[PDB]
Amino acid sequence: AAPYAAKLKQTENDLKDIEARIKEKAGVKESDTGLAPSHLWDIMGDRQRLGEEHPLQVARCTKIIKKYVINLKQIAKFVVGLGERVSPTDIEEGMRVGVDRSKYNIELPLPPRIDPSVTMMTVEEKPDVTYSDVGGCKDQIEKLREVVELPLLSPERFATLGIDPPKGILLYGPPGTGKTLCARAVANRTDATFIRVIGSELVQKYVGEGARMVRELFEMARTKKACIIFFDEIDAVGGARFDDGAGGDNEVQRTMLELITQLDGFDPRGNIKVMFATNRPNTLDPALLRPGRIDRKVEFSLPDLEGRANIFRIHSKSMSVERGIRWELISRLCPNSTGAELRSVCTEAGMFAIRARRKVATEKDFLKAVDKVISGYKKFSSTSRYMQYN
Amino acid sequence: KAPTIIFIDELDAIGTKRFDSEKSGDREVQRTMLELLNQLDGFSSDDRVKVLAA
Amino acid sequence: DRGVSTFSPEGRLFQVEYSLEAIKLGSTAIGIATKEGVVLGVEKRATSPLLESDSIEKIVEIDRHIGCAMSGLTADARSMIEHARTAAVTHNLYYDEDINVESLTQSVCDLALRFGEGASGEERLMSRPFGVALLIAGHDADDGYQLFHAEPSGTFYRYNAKAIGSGSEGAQAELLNEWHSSLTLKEAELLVLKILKQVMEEKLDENNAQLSCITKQDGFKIYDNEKTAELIKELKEKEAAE
Amino acid sequence: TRCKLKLLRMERIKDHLLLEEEFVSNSEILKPFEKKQEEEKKQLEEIRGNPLSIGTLEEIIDDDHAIVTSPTMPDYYVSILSFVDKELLEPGCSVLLHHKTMSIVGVLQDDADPMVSVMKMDKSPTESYSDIGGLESQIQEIKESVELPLTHPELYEEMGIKPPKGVILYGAPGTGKTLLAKAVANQTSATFLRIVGSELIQKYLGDGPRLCRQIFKVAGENAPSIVFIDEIDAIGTKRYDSNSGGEREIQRTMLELLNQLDGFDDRGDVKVIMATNKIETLDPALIRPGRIDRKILFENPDLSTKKKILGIHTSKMNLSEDVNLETLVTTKDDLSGADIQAMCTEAGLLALRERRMQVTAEDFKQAKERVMKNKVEENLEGLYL
Ligand SMILES: Nc1ncnc2c1ncn2[C@@H]1O[C@H](COP(=O)(O)OP(=O)(O)OP(=O)(O)O)[C@@H](O)[C@H]1O
Ligand SMILES: Nc1ncnc2c1ncn2[C@@H]1O[C@H](COP(=O)(O)OP(=O)(O)OP(=O)(O)O)[C@@H](O)[C@H]1O
Ligand SMILES: [Mg+2]
Ligand SMILES: [Mg+2]
């Protein structure tokens, strides 16, 4: 033992001695973006960088007095005037403008409100779920195409009838049918700006903090033409009308009332299409599910025994399969199963092909696989309770 | 601009009966309901402001 | 806790909705009534190879021309079988005559109604339940073979054929195609097994199935386990001609 | 013994030589550098001088302007000029302004946070699989969905279809769930994030939803990743008042837990790993299979699995011929694995009190009496109901 004890004392001192000298030397060693084109930029950008073009201390107008009154964002009020050649139409109420750094005078007006920025990170950039991805050829998928896609691609046909085109549509049902799987699909195909919100993103402790948000999001959607504002998971901020008399339901119900007064509006909505993906229409509020704002409402159904024979064609054609797997045969054996569980028979036959050491998933690995996932994921009803009615 | 119409769309934002409350943000909300009732009392030059409320 | 008393502001007694789930859990029970012999067949669902198949009873004799098959918890049913047996024999002391089939259903349905709060001295000897269905089948002079469907609701209808239990949905859709008005006894007996095979968890054998009929001359008669093994064997010949 | 030291000396002849060579060629051997590196460092430094004032980018304009806000306060409408790439400019980012005329002289700023410290882990566990050995096939389902599509891209392209996602660990306590997770993060050597589910409930209200949206943006960046939510049952009782818990705080955590793991977001690779001992309180929108694929079920091991389990813990202890290893296992009649581990920590605690440094047959049969008395004193049934 003793010959090797004297070698455990070196291993301890030595691994840390090395370690400090190597990380300080390596450093970021002077790596700063720009690279090879920024040397030609140095000719152009040195005569402008010295100009006072910048800085313009950004301010914001509080009163046009038929001259102009700005309020700096430091709190100190000044009366300024026109610039080099700006039109007197540019200066509007509550608009930000840049003013000369020294003696204050409007040089260049600037777009409005610096509260938008928590609302530009909610906008996604063309999802990859395509439009044939969704199961069946149901008539319910064409109703999504008759409320959103069709009146914006051709407003010629809804102008001859005379009808106000239906603008809303509600997607509701049991989970696993794709409420978000068909709202991604429709964001790929329509090429209209999609604006996803999380309805449980608004909540904070400081009341009417989600009032600011809801306002500015609603304006940001008003400016771009053809938009779709997809509110997911509005069971929080979309609850029943009640009044506990003692809790903190008072913060919660602020953000809903502000959601109500913009939807209908003094100034109607201007080419905004409305989607709601809810789990339940059962607790949802009586002022949101009241029909001018919902228009036409299509509940997405549990696929029938023909709807699962259709769906089973999307997941078994992409796997490598021997020829002659009747898609009716595995759909029968299965009980009443969503399409999110009918996707998991392919994945459990794919993990059993690897165990059995097969390069092909066959009709034998799918018969076993059914038995395992139907038992397994059926047993134990999550909470196996729920209720909370009486 | 008196007489003029202030139209309040909704009124359940400040119209809580609850202003005897026990640790809630009703102590900030209720402060804009009571500044209402003072700016609704008679002191003339407000005898000519009306109100709709839905 | 919900009352038995309370209403759901839809208009519904919560408890009835929960009872009608318990049917569906229990084992499959098919009945096909024709003009030549009512056939009742059920799936036993033997739960271990140790347990003896034939002790289990889910085809039950009410009298000697009213046979009955039950689905759901077999315990709940122990009380309601006994009540039905007495009443049919009571009538046979009292009018020396076969109890109508329809009438017997009504008396079962009446006990089913009972589950009440049990206010004052009033006798409601249950406080709960009766989560089981019956396929009450019979023959009498007034109407030919009949078949009736009892619920725990206190609600019954006549039916030309009705499935109930786990595979009720599937069995229902095959019945609306296959049922006819020209079926023979021998064709109905083979047809019941074919619809019972699809929704049987296990392979169709007579060690998890029991067949019975009621036919005018015989009365009630449950089949031999030897006969049934032979009708299984003949189904697969006709199917293997196709 | 010798194996270890040959390699440790082999990496201290590499570290020594490389540091002397790489220091000498930055301070003496300059030819591909030399003139061209002395001109580039001289141009960028002179042009922006110093001090440089760090700012925060609220928004970009595409004509080469930005609105930056100092953190002190005074806002500025600055210019994007020279020695800057717009690939890294975007909201939240830290830029360098010139302290007189503020022009964005470049972006290189990322300043670590004590909120991204608590989430990210520095650990490298000192146990690897087969110190969990036993319940053998329960770590051979978590290796089919965590390790195996990273290691062989081949097999999951060959069958096609989408790969599995996630797992839930639930079952009897004393079945090792916590060390099972601490082993699937050490094998793979992927970026293992780790959060207890009880930090998601805080006295602050609506601070829940901001904290777990943060957790998933950090996770998406370092992807491929494994997230441990250890104890997601804990969200079911822990609460400080009735509104910092109650329906209010529990719905905020669900909603959040629902968006991160499957939403419109179109999440990159976060594998999720949850430890738990409550399955009948979870969201029914997660034990929806097809978020979370194969769930793992654990029970108390049987007598031959508990022979493999007691052999991992007893090599640690001093070994004798006297020791009766097989008879501690037999007597226990489906008793968990957290007790087997409380009995070998109890054998060296009796051994130290004596100041006898051998663990023999006597110290293990004494330590089993102390382990069966605490769990049996807490059984106040006495005469069996
Ligand atoms: N109709 C369908 N056809 C093909 N696949 C489907 C369908 N419905 C669901 N899926 C599959 O199941 C996956 C998960 O379902 P999804 O997450 O869309 O459920 P959800 O409807 O949004 O439920 P919830 O929002 O309450 O959790 C999808 O990514 C998709 O692979
Ligand atoms: N089946 C097993 N094989 C090998 N070791 C085991 C086994 N079960 C338990 N152990 C040992 O017991 C120790 C204590 O386990 P740990 O604290 O991780 O258990 P747990 O089941 O996670 O407990 P809890 O029920 O409190 O969540 C483990 O760290 C592990 O070494
Ligand atoms: Mg959804
Ligand atoms: Mg643990």
What is the 3-class SS of B1-54, one letter each residue? CCCEEEEECCCCCCCCCCCCCCCCCHHHHHHHHHHHHHHHCCCCCCCCEEEEEC
Determine which helix (DSSP H) or strand (DSSP E) holds D60, and give its type and residue range.
strand D52-61
Contact between A98 and A107 under an 8 Å Cβ cutoff? The reply is yes
Candidate from D262, D266, D288, D292 with most ligand 1 atoms within 8 A of CB, to mutate? D262
3-state SS, residue C149: strand
Please name the chains neighbouring D, where neighbouring means 3+ C-beta pairs under 8 angstroms.
A
Backbone phi, psi, residue A355, to 5°: -70, -45
Alpha helices per DSSP H over C72-161: 74-94, 101-113
Note if the bond before D163 is cis, omega within 30 degrees: no
Q: State the amino acid at position A215 in one-letter form.
A: R
Determine which helix (DSSP H) or strand (DSSP E) holds D99, and give its type and residue range.
none
Dig out the tokens for D218 from the structure.
Answer: 């950090």
Q: State the amino acid at position B31 in one-letter form.
A: R
Experimental method: cryo-EM
Alpha-carbon distance of D178 to D85, in angstroms, equals 46
Read off the CATH number of the domain in which C104 is found.
3.60.20.10
Instruction: Determine how β-strand A168-172 pairs with β-strand A298-299.
Output: parallel
Ligand 2 atom at minimum distance from D275 CA: 27
Contact between D306 and D276 under an 8 Å Cβ cutoff? The reply is no
Give buried/exposed letters for D83-108 (b at 16+ CB in 10 A, else e). bbeeebbeeeeebbbbeebbbbbbbb
Which residue is listed with tokens 């260049």? Answer: A108
Q: Which of D292, D154, D180, D155 has its CA nearest to residue A352? A: D155
Q: Which of D298, D354, D116 has its CA nearest to residue D218? A: D116
C6, C169, C198 ranked by CB distance to A390: nearest: C6
Alpha-carbon distance of C5 to C20, in angstroms, equals 18
Does any ligand 1 atom lie closer than 6 A to the CB of residue A269?
A: no
SS (H, E, C) A1-64: CHHHHHHHHHHHHHHHHHHHHHHHHHCCCCCCCCCCCHHHHHHHHHHHHHCCCCCEEECCEEEE
Candidate from A128, A140, A181, A338 with most ligand 1 atoms within 8 A of CB, to mutate? A181
Dig out the tokens for D164 from the structure.
Answer: 């599995």
Q: State the amino acid at position D353 in one-letter form.
A: R
**Which range marks the domain in which residue C53 is found?**
1-242
* Residues lining ligand 2, Cβ inside 6 A: D 132-135, 173-179, 277, 301, 309, 312, 337-338, 341
Alpha-carbon distance of C221 to C67, in angstroms, equals 8
| Count of structural domains, chain C | 1
Which residue is listed with tokens 């047959």? Answer: D361
Interface of D with A in 26-65 (CB under 8 A): 41, 43-44, 47, 58-59, 65
Chains C and D touch (3+ CB pairs under 8 A): no
Q: How many CB atoms lie within 10 A of CB A74?
A: 11
Kindly identify which residue of chain D lies nearest to residue A175, measuring between CA atoms: D285
Q: State the amino acid at position C208 in one-letter form.
A: N
Q: Which of B6, B19, B29 to mutate against chain A (most A CBs within 10 Å)?
A: B29
Alpha-carbon distance of D361 to C84, in angstroms, equals 69
